[PDB]
Amino acid sequence: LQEKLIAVNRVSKTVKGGRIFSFTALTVVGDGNGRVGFGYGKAREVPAAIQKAMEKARRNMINVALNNGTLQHPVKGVHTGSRVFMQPASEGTGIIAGGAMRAVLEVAGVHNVLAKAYGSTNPINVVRATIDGLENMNSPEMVAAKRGKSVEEIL
Amino acid sequence: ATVNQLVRKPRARKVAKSNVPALEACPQKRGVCTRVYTTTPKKPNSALRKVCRVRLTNGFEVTSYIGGEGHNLQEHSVILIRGGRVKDLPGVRYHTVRGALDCSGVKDRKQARSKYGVKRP
Amino acid sequence: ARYLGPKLKLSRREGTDLFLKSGVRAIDTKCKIEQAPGQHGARKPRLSDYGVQLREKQKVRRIYGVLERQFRNYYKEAARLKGNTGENLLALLEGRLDNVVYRMGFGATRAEARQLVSHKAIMVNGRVVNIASYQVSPNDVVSIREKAKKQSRVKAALELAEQREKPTWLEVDAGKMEGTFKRKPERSDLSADINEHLIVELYSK
Amino acid sequence: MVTIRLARHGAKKRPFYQVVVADSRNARNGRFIERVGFFNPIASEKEEGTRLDLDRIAHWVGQGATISDRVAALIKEVN
Amino acid sequence: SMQDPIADMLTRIRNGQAANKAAVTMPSSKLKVAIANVLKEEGFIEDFKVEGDTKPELELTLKYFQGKAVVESIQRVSRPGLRIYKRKDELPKVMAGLGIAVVSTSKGVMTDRAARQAGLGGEIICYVA
Amino acid sequence: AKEDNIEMQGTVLETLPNTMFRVELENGHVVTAHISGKMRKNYIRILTGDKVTVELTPYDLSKGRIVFRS
Amino acid sequence: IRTLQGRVVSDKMEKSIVVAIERFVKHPIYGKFIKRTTKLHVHDENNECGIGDVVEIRECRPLSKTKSWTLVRVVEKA
RNA sequence: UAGCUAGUAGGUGGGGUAACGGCUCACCUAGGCGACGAUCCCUAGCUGGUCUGAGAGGAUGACCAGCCACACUGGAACUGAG
RNA sequence: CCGCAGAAGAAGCACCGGCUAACUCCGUGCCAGCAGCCGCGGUAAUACGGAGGGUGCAAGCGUUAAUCGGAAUUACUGGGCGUAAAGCGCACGCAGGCGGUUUGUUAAGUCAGAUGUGAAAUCCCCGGGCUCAACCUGGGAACUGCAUCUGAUACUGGCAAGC
Ligand SMILES: [K+]
Ligand SMILES: [K+]
Ligand SMILES: [K+]
Ligand SMILES: [K+]
Ligand SMILES: [K+]
Ligand SMILES: [K+]
Ligand SMILES: [K+]
Ligand SMILES: [K+]
Ligand SMILES: [K+]
Ligand SMILES: [Mg+2]
Ligand SMILES: [Mg+2]
Ligand SMILES: [Mg+2]
Ligand SMILES: [Mg+2]
Ligand SMILES: [Mg+2]
Ligand SMILES: [Mg+2]
Ligand SMILES: [Mg+2]
Ligand SMILES: [Mg+2]
Ligand SMILES: [Mg+2]
Ligand SMILES: [Mg+2]
Ligand SMILES: [Mg+2]
Ligand SMILES: [Mg+2]
Ligand SMILES: [Mg+2]
Ligand SMILES: [Mg+2]
Ligand SMILES: [Mg+2]
């Protein structure tokens, strides 16, 4: 599996003494062949926060139907304030995505895609919206299955 | 907004003004120093920052920052001002160009010489 | 308009042999290739995604010996040309006469090849061309001029190119000192160390 | 009147002429009625240095268009 | 008041699918039946029927596949407040041609695919995916 | 390497908002002085009547920095 | 040959009518089909047209300052 | 900026123009324009294009080419195919 | 184009805290100064000034101005309005926008085909010519438009009769 650290944020809770600082870690993991998952870990140190995130990411991996290193069709993902748009691209386009979306799409094994992130670009909510995008994507074969047709009749 | 409301009254684009009005869309303007003085900056910072009140050719009286260590400007010095806000000085939207007209280059500068009007040693 | 500074500093910064020396001697014997140049070069800091993209771009530029403006133009052309921009970019660079002269084995380095070209020692189809960026096309015959066939560096450069992996898309004759640019190189023919998609992404910013 | 003449294009020291039908009062490189060919005075050995639409020239001569001296020479060399 | 019977029909399908209803029923019309026929033959609904005479009522049998509703999305495109027409060359592909656009042509209501092959444009009634 | 200041004694004639002061100097010129950073950080209070050292600049003789209070 | 059809909105001039030609145009930006009206002063030799009538008109030479259209026929009487 | 207009809107006849025409004149009728923005005020030569933009847009109209206007300022005609 | 002589006559500018590729020492001590924003400087400053080293560009390099972008931040494509800015205090109602269902008819909108036009240049594609390139150039494509003619009639509009 490929693994990528997206963001590390220092968070704080006030106590009577003062402020207890701690670190969060957004990571994504994927096989580079359709499977991808994100994890969010919290710890008092950064390296522990990452390792927690990686372990959560490994167990929360979705499946995505990719069409030879790109998407099947245009997809819109939403989570919280994050609205993402992605669409298929021709070979050699590369990943035209911004920040958090790129990490997801990289490890998922999407080589060619055109993406944009609207609204909030908070990494946590962007990653969710992206993966929300990719999970709701449909292959020709599954569209054909639900509609009770062949792949030829649909396409 | 409904389609029919936009037909009746289209989307009005916001008329964004210049941050540097006294230049009047010119890259520099010449002016005469009416006063040359120091000013204390805003809350977090502390200094006596060198500035001049400049009467421009187009008749705008503005304040301009005199960058670099040390300057030769006096009242009735003729200077060239460019655009450039100084964040910690209220109202200072212009820099004086060093090494142009009466404004000297900075003495003994060796790095970023072109920003302070200093010839190559 | 050319880089005239130290060569191995560039190789060291990329952390790979960019082939900027003849290769009679190993690069590790002439410099500390593992170590980046300068005082703080023994440190290996974590490089950003932008930094990875940049250092990939600068690697390709430094191999072929192309400044940014001319390289950006090669990118624009590759984007325009149909097919894979990344593969097109590498094809254009390989097209260059200075490169072709080097790959045939007339110059020991691309800089020595660039000098041969610039000093009116190379002919393309019997006609003198002294432009390093001249795009060679299929079935073109690159050759050494009769004056330049005696040059001792050209004799030596052929012996070095015999050591290297021979281009399949060229066909040189050592006795004649001419070669035919048979075809444009495929992406497979070039080395797999180049991640050209990083350059495509860099310019897509 | 209507004339058939060369408008000069190309680059400095490398003229390329468009053979145009124009009202004679218009500027050389200005308003024209129809383009009817071109003349490349510095054309390479195996490049078509001259092309004229002789039928369209004939049509315009029929309607009483004059031909400039240089175009008349070009019509001769083509024929 | 009721000013878009087609939007209403689409909303009934959309709401019915969200509420796992076996069928949805509504006041019938020739155009509704025409759209229903496209939905059926493309396989977004199972079947339909019209019942009544003075006040006919259209029933649609909704499909489900592995529990999930077959109609993922269903959007009114052309609407009373803004009509949308397209020439044959600018007929919309829905979901890269995995969905359908229902197009009113001069040779009757049909899919965008069938409108392209017929070589007709027309009014874009709805997207279905 | 920096240019040099002119130190001069003076009496605070009035306090102004935000650690600004009128200070009549030895020579009799009234400058609008401000507190030093070191005096601000170390909480040295200045009052009307206090005798102060003032660093002046030749660029402006209407302004100063109070660096010491005696 | 070339004619417009429109509705009479005035008949108060001697031998002249105002005719409104309604057009239905897609709005350039927003895509909504709007109603647009062209008013034309039209020559009516016999003073036959009244307000409300639908008339066919054709373009002709100038007949007055504002008139360059002439009545072909009344399509519908009001 | 919400009302604007008396040759003003139309007709008839005479005159006028290379030519249609309130172009002009006399007389008659009382019209004509305007929230689909008249009138008024401010700014501006227009276009092919140019820059930017994934596109839709936004900004722009230097050079080159088409069109227009002007020629110290305000009037005016004369000559002429113009 | 040929010959001659000799590396000979030919490298700078910005930057190196984060955004943003590139780090140390010395000086200074919220001073002097930096700065696009966040910020830096109050004694060990990778942020000031100098130096060494490095990074980026290179006969240029920076700075300023100006436009678009990023800005879905006027949102047609493509946004909002309980509490973040935003529902008129409420109604009635003219203009306007929108209009249940069936048949016929019309053919305005709409759709199809065709014809004419949409100057050349420019842009784009395949070629050609200057040693290459810029540049010049052949042909094509494009000019998303407008008008007309002939058709189509589902939908929208008109008209007629109904429910
Ligand atoms: K400070
Ligand atoms: K390409
Ligand atoms: K008049
Ligand atoms: K009259
Ligand atoms: K324009
Ligand atoms: K004048
Ligand atoms: K004459
Ligand atoms: K909208
Ligand atoms: K109809
Ligand atoms: Mg250059
Ligand atoms: Mg007129
Ligand atoms: Mg003007
Ligand atoms: Mg955009
Ligand atoms: Mg005359
Ligand atoms: Mg120190
Ligand atoms: Mg916008
Ligand atoms: Mg908003
Ligand atoms: Mg409140
Ligand atoms: Mg509120
Ligand atoms: Mg209320
Ligand atoms: Mg209806
Ligand atoms: Mg029609
Ligand atoms: Mg054209
Ligand atoms: Mg009807």
Write the DSSP assignment of F27-39 as a string of letters.
TS-EEEEEE-HHH
Following CA atoms A106, A110, A111, A115 in sequence, which dihedral angle do they give, to the nearest 10 degrees? -90
User: Phi first, then psi: what are they for E31, rounded to 5°?
Assistant: -70, -45
Number of domains in chain B: 1
Q: Where are the alpha helices (DSSP H) in E3-126?
A: 5-18, 30-42, 112-118
The verdict on E51 and E96 lying in the same domain is: no
Nearest to C164 by CA among C122, C84, C104, C95: C104
D78 membership: H or E segment, kind and range? helix D69-78
Q: Is C93 exposed, middle or buried (0-12, 13-18, 19+ CB in 10 A)?
A: buried
**β-bridge partners, E127:** E75, E101
End-to-end Cα spacing for chain D: 26
Strands C178-181 and C170-173: antiparallel
Domain ranges, residue B32: 1-121
Strands F20-25 and F30-35: antiparallel
Number of domains in chain D: 1
The torsion region of residue A55 among left (phi > 0), alpha (psi -120 to 50) and beta comes to alpha
| Residue in the structure block whose two tokens are 């490929």 | A2
Query: Which residues lie near nucleic chain H, judged by CB under 7 A?
Result: A 116; B 8, 13; D 26-27, 29-31; G 10, 12-16, 18, 22, 28-29, 35-37, 39, 41, 43, 61-67
User: Phi first, then psi: what are they for G18, rounded to 5°?
Assistant: -95, 130
Q: How far is E97 from A72, CA to CA, in rounded Å?
A: 10
Instruction: Answer for the pair C177, C105: CB distance below 8 angstroms, yes or no.
Output: no
Cα distances (angstroms) measured from residue G26 to each of A11, B120, E84: 55, 66, 10
Nearest to A5 by CA among A90, A87, A73, A104: A104
Q: How far is B3 from chain E (nearest CA, A)?
A: 7
Give D7's Cβ-side CA count (13 Å radius).
Answer: 21
How many C-beta neighbours within 10 Å does residue F31 have?
21
Nearest to C101 by CA among C151, C156, C187, C170: C170
Q: How far is B36 from B75, CA to CA, in rounded Å?
A: 6
Q: How far is B68 from B51, CA to CA, in rounded Å?
A: 11
Experimental method: cryo-EM
Rg of chain D on CA atoms, in Å: 12
The verdict on E107 and E65 lying in the same domain is: no
The verdict on E65 and E15 lying in the same domain is: yes
State the SS3 of chain E.
CCCCHHHHHHHHHHHHHHCCCCEEEEECCHHHHHHHHHHHHHCCEEEEEEECCCCCEEEEEECEECCEECCCCEEECCECCECCEECHHHCCCHHHHCCEEEEEECCEEEEHHHHHHHCCCEEEEEEEC
Q: What CATH number is associated with residue E113?
A: 3.30.1490.10
Q: How far is A79 from A117, CA to CA, in rounded Å?
A: 11
Question: Which residues of chain E does G31 touch, with a Cβ-Cβ cutoff of 8 Å?
Answer: 82, 84
Q: How far is E61 from E49, CA to CA, in rounded Å?
A: 9
CA–centroid distance, residue G5 to ligand 18 (Å)? 58
Q: How far is C155 from C144, CA to CA, in rounded Å?
A: 11
Q: Where are the alpha helices (DSSP H) in C105-178?
A: 110-118, 152-163
Domain ranges, residue D4: 1-79
The verdict on E55 and E9 lying in the same domain is: yes
DSSP helix/strand/coil, B94: strand
The verdict on E10 and E64 lying in the same domain is: yes
Nearest to G46 by CA among G15, G7, G5: G15
How many C-beta neighbours within 10 Å does residue A4 have?
19
Tell which of E69, E88, E103 closes a domain. E69
Q: For the packed helices C85-95 and C49-64, what is the interaxial angle rounded to 10 degrees?
A: 30
Q: How far is A29 from E61, CA to CA, in rounded Å?
A: 42
D57 membership: H or E segment, kind and range? helix D54-62
Q: How far is C92 from C70, CA to CA, in rounded Å?
A: 11
Our measurement of CA D21 to C1' I132, in angstroms, reads: 37
Q: What CATH number is associated with residue B107?
A: 2.40.50.140
Resolution of the entry in angstroms = 2.8
End-to-end Cα spacing for chain G: 25
Q: Which two tokens stand for residue F20?
A: 């600004």
Q: What is the CATH number of domain A2-62?
A: 3.30.160.20
Q: How far is G78 from G67, CA to CA, in rounded Å?
A: 23
User: Cβ of A91 under 8 Å from any chain C Cβ?
Assistant: yes
Q: DSSP labels for A61-114?
A: EE----SSSS-SS-EEEEETTEEEEEEE--TT--EE--THHHHHHHHHT--SEE
How many C-beta neighbours within 10 Å does residue E85 have?
15
Domain A63-147 has CATH 3.30.230.10: yes
Sign of dihedral through CA atoms F12, F18, F19, F25?
A: negative
Q: What type of residue is C190?
A: L
Domain ranges, residue E43: 5-69
The verdict on E108 and E54 lying in the same domain is: no
Q: What type of residue is C90?
A: L
**What structural domains and CATH numbers belong to chain C?**
7-93+190-204 (1.10.1050.10), 94-180 (3.10.290.10)
User: Phi first, then psi: what are they for D63, rounded to 5°?
Assistant: -90, 10
Q: List Cβ neighbours of E114 (8 Å cut-off, separation of 6 or more).
A: none
Q: How far is D55 from D79, CA to CA, in rounded Å?
A: 13
Strands G3-13 and F60-69: unpaired
How many E-G residue pairs are in contact by the CB < 8 A criterion? 7
| Burial annotation E25-49 (CB, 10 A radius, 16+ → b, else e) | ebebeeebeebbebbbebbbbbebe
Q: How far is B38 from F56, CA to CA, in rounded Å?
A: 11
Sequence ranges of the domains in chain A? 2-62, 63-147
Q: What angle do CA D71, D72, D77 make, to 5 degrees?
A: 90
Instruction: Answer for the pair D72, D5: CB distance below 8 angstroms, yes or no.
Output: no
